[PDB]
Design a protein around this ligand. Structure first.
Ligand SMILES: CN[C@@H]1[C@@H](O)[C@@H](O[C@@H]2[C@@H](O)[C@H](O[C@H]3O[C@H](CN)CC[C@H]3N)[C@@H](N)C[C@H]2N)OC[C@]1(C)O
Ligand SMILES: CN[C@@H]1[C@@H](O)[C@@H](O[C@@H]2[C@@H](O)[C@H](O[C@H]3O[C@H](CN)CC[C@H]3N)[C@@H](N)C[C@H]2N)OC[C@]1(C)O
Ligand SMILES: CN[C@@H]1[C@@H](O)[C@@H](O[C@@H]2[C@@H](O)[C@H](O[C@H]3O[C@H](CN)CC[C@H]3N)[C@@H](N)C[C@H]2N)OC[C@]1(C)O
Ligand SMILES: [Mg+2]
Ligand SMILES: [Mg+2]
Ligand SMILES: [Mg+2]
Ligand SMILES: [Mg+2]
Ligand SMILES: [Mg+2]
Ligand SMILES: [Mg+2]
Ligand SMILES: [Mg+2]
Ligand SMILES: [Mg+2]
Ligand SMILES: [Mg+2]
Ligand SMILES: [Mg+2]
Ligand SMILES: [Mg+2]
Ligand SMILES: [Mg+2]
Ligand SMILES: [Mg+2]
Ligand SMILES: [Mg+2]
Ligand SMILES: [Mg+2]
Ligand SMILES: [Mg+2]
Ligand SMILES: [Mg+2]
Ligand SMILES: [Mg+2]
Ligand SMILES: [Mg+2]
Ligand SMILES: [Mg+2]
Ligand SMILES: [Mg+2]
Ligand SMILES: [Mg+2]
Ligand SMILES: [Mg+2]
Ligand SMILES: [Mg+2]
Ligand SMILES: [Mg+2]
Ligand SMILES: [Mg+2]
Ligand SMILES: [Mg+2]
Ligand SMILES: [Mg+2]
Ligand SMILES: [Mg+2]
Ligand SMILES: [Mg+2]
Ligand SMILES: [Mg+2]
Ligand SMILES: [Mg+2]
Ligand SMILES: [Mg+2]
Ligand SMILES: [Mg+2]
Ligand SMILES: [Mg+2]
Ligand SMILES: [Mg+2]
Ligand SMILES: [Mg+2]
Ligand SMILES: [Mg+2]
Ligand SMILES: [Mg+2]
Ligand SMILES: [Mg+2]
Ligand SMILES: [Mg+2]
Ligand SMILES: [Mg+2]
Ligand SMILES: [Mg+2]
Ligand SMILES: [Mg+2]
Ligand SMILES: [Mg+2]
Ligand SMILES: [Mg+2]
Ligand SMILES: [Mg+2]
Ligand SMILES: [Mg+2]
Ligand SMILES: [Mg+2]
Ligand SMILES: [Mg+2]
Ligand SMILES: [Mg+2]
Ligand SMILES: [Mg+2]
Ligand SMILES: [Mg+2]
Ligand SMILES: [Mg+2]
Ligand SMILES: [Mg+2]
Ligand SMILES: [Mg+2]
Ligand SMILES: [Mg+2]
Lengths: 169, 212, 296, 159, 58
RNA sequence: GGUUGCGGCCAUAUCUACCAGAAAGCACCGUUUCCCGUCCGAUCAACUGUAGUUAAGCUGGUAAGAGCCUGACCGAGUAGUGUAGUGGGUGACCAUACGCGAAACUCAGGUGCUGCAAUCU
RNA sequence: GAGAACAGAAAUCUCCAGUAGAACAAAAGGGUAAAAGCCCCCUUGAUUUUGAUUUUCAGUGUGAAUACAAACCAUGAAAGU
RNA sequence: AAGCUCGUAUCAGUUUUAUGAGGUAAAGCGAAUGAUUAGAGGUUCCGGGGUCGAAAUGACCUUGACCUAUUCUCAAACUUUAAAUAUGUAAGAAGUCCUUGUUACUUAAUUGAACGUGGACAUUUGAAUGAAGAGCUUUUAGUGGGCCAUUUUUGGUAAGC
């Protein structure tokens, strides 16, 4: 049947990819600090593209992964700004999805000119329960087909709760 | 600017091809190994006549070209440029070297690549040709003509088989009018009696009658 | 799986499968080697490992040696034996680890003959020591802690099995710094925190801080300590007497059975599918070949 | 220049095996060797410590010593017109007990049991090994087996 | 100059005159190389059993 | 017989797709006070065996499946090769004599066996 | 490969597949997957004393390595290395 | 050359029996790496063109790239497999087995490990053939330009190279 297959939201990952380091970076990760409440993590540039103004290991972007009800909060608060409208793209065929928004302020952050404005990549990862088989140390293993998170199967969960829209075909 | 074909005729030295340690080698004078109507379906041309090497020797690319050209140039202008299919059955991957130039200290003779040649066996096929049995004599004399471009003895033999397939005419006509042979390009594919029964039947729906 | 997935003939053909017990993720061989293998000058002297394995809420302590024919078990004491010693709940806990590692310590020491010798620390104040050398008499039984795949974390509960197996009198070399009460910030152990843990004083201190600040949860968990009414402060003396029971009778009463292998054989053989004959296979196939042909 | 290094020329010889790579199974370490055990040497490339020289690869020897990870193996190496004894220090991963011995033991022990049973039965023991003897007389029956007449076959092509 | 660089020619001929002599086995090989721990004790395990065959012989 | 913990050999055990799985054991699962670890109690630590489920992990079965393994009236006594001749041939090369003898391939059978200890309608 | 604002073939974020198709100063060849690779933490065994061995070989020297003994140490819960 | 100690005790440019190692020949490329002829069939946030257009995350023809299942040809520095010839060790008295001393090494443990005392078994005492025996030491000559045949084989068009 379907007793122990839910669709939980595993984690939500906010991502601010900003093409430089230094001050403007710390202001972009000060943003994510007050949204998540957790202290967030920074990403070094893989190589030097020189037309993106990035050097190898220059600490370009920032992100944070959030789990539990703190996600559904920020998912909804971000799903607001999308007018509860997503696309058929935005959904991986592995059962997860994500969107993006300019103006982090468009969810209740005030403005605070000493900080500034940044757009965010929102990414929401889904799995059913029992997916720690693929995570735990001992006896790791991949979860069978019936229980896997698919695309057609997550959209059917995404319209059901939240009432929102898939929209493109 | 080429050394006479005598010097490189015999198979004396180890096969030494273009390689990560060669790199320096010229372009083969033969390029195009299939001629005539080369999409022609397996049943279109039954007849096959090979050119067979009777020696253990070396054919140069530039000979392979000149015989290819020669034979085809005839075979088309008698029975027509769609009448047959000419498959050069050997490739020249062996790099020939030349040491270009009393004296003194100190000689070293390793060659820079002078050309390429196909190492052939005794009874190894140079040319294969398929046409309809109607066109036999034209093909044969066409191979008999390219013969003169090759050093040393070679022979032409009517194939026991059906075109370029691996089946004899009767054994092929067996699997053909039984449901077992399906067209692919110029060649064919065959019904496996092992593997997934599902797409075994997706392919060869002609089969699964068990009749003509 | 997927379409652009689905490994080829090649990939399979050339694949090299690991060991079964690495494929099942149960055995880290790079460690197993370095544990089991014996000094070649000590010949057939067996190397004896103490295997400590937590299931979900049960504990295993096995003293094992090794053969090319497979490993051999000296003796084992599981936590789920702990009721006969008067522990009916929290058998997955640090103080049960200690309890189980001390049962396994005496049990083996019992069956060997070193039982009256090498009694370990009987007072169990939780001070840091390892069982010493009897002068003019056999050396203690030396057994090595096999942690399995357990992450080694200071205060983790595999090292409860340790402390109890050491305090049982077995020789199990080890250091302190993985014992709860080891200060990160200094070289110090505070064995008072370790004695509390040995007796469950971190679990008993939980019930108290629970009973008055949440009774909804306290319904849920400790529910057995209600229905049997063993309250928070009563815990330390549950264990304190459990050791008494332990060193009293280690002897391993086996289960009473109730039925037999033949019975368990038949009742289980009910449920397994027997393999098809090739004749049976030639049937279904020839049956499918009749089916799908002839306009399906 | 010419090159001869310690592993010079060991390319395929010390090559691991097919599908047999990766850390070695435990019974290799579980074996016991005492002095005077007759061992085969084959180097296992994945274990670089205590590894034999390419020469001794395939050479059988007698262990003269037992240390922590290693058996000392004593092997007689011909140099010039004589043999020289050489003492190899080999890690267990390259050493293998040799079966050349066992069949001779499984014979000796057989001869004692053959002998005692024979003698206490009586004389007539035959315990030396005779090599393969000529065939004894026989009559092959024609019955339902009638000689099949074959002939050499003509020339054909089928290319 | 330019004179021949190397050969093994004839060299087995000379080798076989006096003939590739077999290694010459003994009982009681020397302990050379044997571990010092084993040997040091084994000294007393031998010195020890020599006294025991003196007293016992009386 | 089933399952677990420790294994040996390391695919007849791995791969894909399905179906079935009583009992027990596993498991997934609940919690965050305590030792402890993370950006994130996801992993790791800890407490509860309580609140739930065989959904998945696990085990079995299915398939002219892939792979793997085994055999041989397969390829084939073929290729290669030790030995011989004042054999053949302008040669290239080839037969013959006394021996050894493959490979991919073709067909067929098969799809983990088992050591210790515990436990189980 | 399927995904995510500016973001483009290349920035950062995610899941799936992945027997090594990578990495290990350099030549090449071997070897390695809960590693031998990547990150981290702790360190100085790149230390002490004298012998045995293996390669090259005359069985000399040199270079290089291997396995012990006697110390003093490092790391780790520990076997160990 | 000198002998020296011994005398069927060992001895062997050989076979056989048992058991090792090897990666050449061959083979293979609808197996890995690499090279290579030809078609056939799939595919797209999408390589270039063209056509309908006021734009397609348009629709079509096109040509590329890709992907699948096939096809001709290949390797000294490629390979799953893998010969022949050659090559290691064994075929007993220094053997096999029983009892149980020594020890400072080793084990939880007289447990081991090594060396033994004492004890049972010697007609074929443990394959074939051969042996003008076997073992052993000192001392010194000439030599240290080589060349040839068949087979394997490198450079060279080749050479009485
Ligand atoms: C049997 N082998 C033959 C061998 O017999 C020989 O043939 C000669 C051929 O060379 C002679 O002819 C040639 O040589 C003559 C000098 N001897 C001068 C004339 C010229 N045609 C013929 N007159 C006789 C054949 N049997 O040379 C050719 C060959 C194939 O090698
Ligand atoms: C040297 N030329 C070729 C040589 O390359 C090889 O050719 C094979 C040929 O025997 C195979 O053919 C064979 O193998 C099939 C696959 N198992 C099945 C049966 C048969 N068709 C072809 N599949 C591939 C060619 N390269 O063997 C044949 C040949 C003529 O000697
Ligand atoms: C009888 N032993 C085997 C016999 O079982 C059979 O072996 C094949 C084996 O050659 C195939 O595999 C072989 O060929 C592949 C290339 N086509 C590469 C891998 C190689 N082991 C295996 N996949 C199936 C066995 N039955 O054919 C070869 C053999 C040696 O005769
Ligand atoms: Mg995995
Ligand atoms: Mg030749
Ligand atoms: Mg040749
Ligand atoms: Mg040459
Ligand atoms: Mg050849
Ligand atoms: Mg012409
Ligand atoms: Mg000059
Ligand atoms: Mg010159
Ligand atoms: Mg000609
Ligand atoms: Mg002629
Ligand atoms: Mg580890
Ligand atoms: Mg410490
Ligand atoms: Mg060189
Ligand atoms: Mg090998
Ligand atoms: Mg390899
Ligand atoms: Mg591996
Ligand atoms: Mg390894
Ligand atoms: Mg080293
Ligand atoms: Mg006999
Ligand atoms: Mg000269
Ligand atoms: Mg000279
Ligand atoms: Mg020179
Ligand atoms: Mg149940
Ligand atoms: Mg949880
Ligand atoms: Mg945990
Ligand atoms: Mg199910
Ligand atoms: Mg299964
Ligand atoms: Mg199959
Ligand atoms: Mg076999
Ligand atoms: Mg046979
Ligand atoms: Mg056979
Ligand atoms: Mg031949
Ligand atoms: Mg021959
Ligand atoms: Mg001859
Ligand atoms: Mg003749
Ligand atoms: Mg013949
Ligand atoms: Mg023959
Ligand atoms: Mg199977
Ligand atoms: Mg993975
Ligand atoms: Mg590899
Ligand atoms: Mg890995
Ligand atoms: Mg792995
Ligand atoms: Mg030294
Ligand atoms: Mg040296
Ligand atoms: Mg022989
Ligand atoms: Mg070859
Ligand atoms: Mg092959
Ligand atoms: Mg290939
Ligand atoms: Mg080769
Ligand atoms: Mg042999
Ligand atoms: Mg004899
Ligand atoms: Mg003599
Ligand atoms: Mg002299
Ligand atoms: Mg002189
Ligand atoms: Mg001189
Ligand atoms: Mg001269
Ligand atoms: Mg001449």
């Amino acid at each position: 049947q379907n007793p122990m297959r839910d669709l939980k939201i595993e984690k939500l990952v906010l991502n601010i990819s900003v093409g430089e380091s230094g001050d403007r970076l710390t202001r972009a990760s000060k943003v994510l600090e007050q949204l998540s409440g957790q202290t967030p993590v920074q990403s070094k540039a893989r190589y030097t593209v020189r037309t993106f103004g990035i050097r190898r290991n220059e600490k370009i972007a920032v992100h944070v992964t959030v789990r539990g009800p703190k996600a559904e909060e920020i998912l909804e608060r971000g799903l607001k700004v999308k007018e509860y409208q997503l696309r058929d793209r935005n959904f991986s065929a592995t059962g997860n999805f994500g969107f993006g928004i300019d103006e982090h302020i468009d969810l209740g952050i005030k403005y605070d000119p000493s900080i500034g404005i940044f757009g965010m990549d929102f990414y929401v990862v889904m799995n059913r329960p029992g997916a720690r088989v693929t995570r735990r140390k001992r006896c790791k293993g991949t979860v069978g087909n019936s229980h896997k998170t698919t695309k057609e199967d997550t959209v059917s969960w995404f319209k059901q709760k939240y009432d929102a829209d898939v929209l493109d075909k | 600017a080429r050394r006479p074909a005598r010097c490189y005729r015999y198979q004396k030295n180890k096969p030494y091809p273009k390689s990560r340690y060669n790199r320096a080698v010229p372009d083969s004078k033969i390029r195009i190994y299939d001629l005539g109507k080369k999409k022609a379906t397996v049943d279109e041309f039954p007849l096959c006549v090979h050119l067979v090497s009777n020696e253990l020797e070396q054919l140069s690319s530039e000979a392979l070209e000149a015989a290819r050209i020669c034979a085809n140039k005839y075979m088309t202008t008698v029975s027509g440029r769609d009448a047959f299919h000419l498959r050069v059955r050997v490739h020249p991957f062996h790099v020939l070297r030349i040491n270009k130039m009393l004296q003194q200290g100190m000689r070293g003779a390793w060659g820079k690549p002078h050309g390429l040649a196909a190492r052939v066996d005794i009874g190894q096929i140079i040319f294969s040709v398929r046409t309809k049995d109607s066109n036999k004599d034209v093909v044969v004399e066409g191979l008999r003509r390219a013969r003169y471009k090759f050093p040393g003895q070679q022979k032409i033999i009517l194939s026991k088989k059906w075109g370029f397939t691996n089946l004899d005419r009767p054994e092929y006509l067996k699997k053909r009018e039984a449901g077992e042979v399906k067209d692919d390009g110029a060649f064919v594919k065959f019904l496996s009696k092992k593997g997934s029964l599902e797409n075994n039947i997706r392919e060869f729906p002609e089969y699964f009658a068990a009749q003509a | 799986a997927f379409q652009k997935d689905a490994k080829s003939s090649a990939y399979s053909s050339r694949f090299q499968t690991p060991f079964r017990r690495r494929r099942e993720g149960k055995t880290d061989y790079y460690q197993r080697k370095r544990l089991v293998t014996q000094h070649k000058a000590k010949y057939n002297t067996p190397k004896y490992r103490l295997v400590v394995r937590f299931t979900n809420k049960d504990i295993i302590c096995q003293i094992i040696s090794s053969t090319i024919t497979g490993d051999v078990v000296l003796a084992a004491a599981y936590s789920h034996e702990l009721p006969r010693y008067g522990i009916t709940h929290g058998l997955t806990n640090w103080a049960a680890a200690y309890a189980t590692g001390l049962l396994i310590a005496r049990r083996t020491l019992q069956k060997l003959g070193l039982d009256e010798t090498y009694k370990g620390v009987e007072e169990v104040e939780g001070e840091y020591e390892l069982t010493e050398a009897v002068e003019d008499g056999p050396r203690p039984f030396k057994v090595f802690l096999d942690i399995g795949l357990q992450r080694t974390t200071t205060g983790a509960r595999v090292f409860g099995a340790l402390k109890g197996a050491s305090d049982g009198g077995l020789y199990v070399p080890h250091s302190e710094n993985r014992f709860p009460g080891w200060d990160f910030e200094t070289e110090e152990i505070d064995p008072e925190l370790l004695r509390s843990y040995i007796f469950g004083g971190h679990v008993s201190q939980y019930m108290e801080e629970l009973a008055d600040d949440d009774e909804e949860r306290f319904s849920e968990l400790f529910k057995g300590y209600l229905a049997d009414d063993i309250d928070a402060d009563s815990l330390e003396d549950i264990y304190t007497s459990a050791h008494e029971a332990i060193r009293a009778d280690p002897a391993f009463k086996p289960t009473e059975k109730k039925f037999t292998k033949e019975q368990y054989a038949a009742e289980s053989k009910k449920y397994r599918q027997t393999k098809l004959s090739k004749e049976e296979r030639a049937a279904r196939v020839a049956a499918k070949i009749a089916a799908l042909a002839g306009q399906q | 220049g010419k090159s001869h290094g310690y592993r010079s020329r060991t390319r395929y010889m010390f090559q691991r095996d097919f599908r047999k790579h990766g850390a070695v199974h435990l019974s290799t370490y579980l074996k016991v060797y005492k002095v005077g055990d007759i061992v085969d040497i084959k180097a296992n490339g994945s274990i670089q410590k205590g590894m034999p020289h390419k020469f001794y690869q395939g050479k059988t020897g007698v262990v003269y010593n037992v240390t922590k990870s290693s058996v000392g193996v004593i092997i007689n190496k011909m140099v010039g017109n004589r043999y020289l004894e050489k003492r190899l220090n080999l890690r267990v991963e390259h050493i293998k007990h040799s079966k050349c011995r066992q069949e001779f033991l499984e014979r000796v022990k057989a001869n004692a049991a053959k002998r005692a049973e024979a003698k206490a039965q009586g004389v007539a023991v035959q315990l030396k090994r005779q090599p393969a003897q000529p065939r004894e007389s026989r009559i092959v029956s024609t019955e339902g087996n009638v000689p099949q007449t074959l002939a050499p076959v003509p020339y054909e092509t089928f290319i | 100059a330019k004179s021949k660089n190397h050969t093994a020619h004839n060299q087995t001929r000379k080798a076989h005159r006096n003939g590739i002599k077999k290694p010459k086995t003994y009982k009681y090989p020397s302990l050379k190389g044997v571990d010092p721990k084993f040997r040091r004790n084994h000294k007393h395990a031998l010195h020890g059993t020599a006294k025991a065959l003196a007293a016992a012989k009386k």
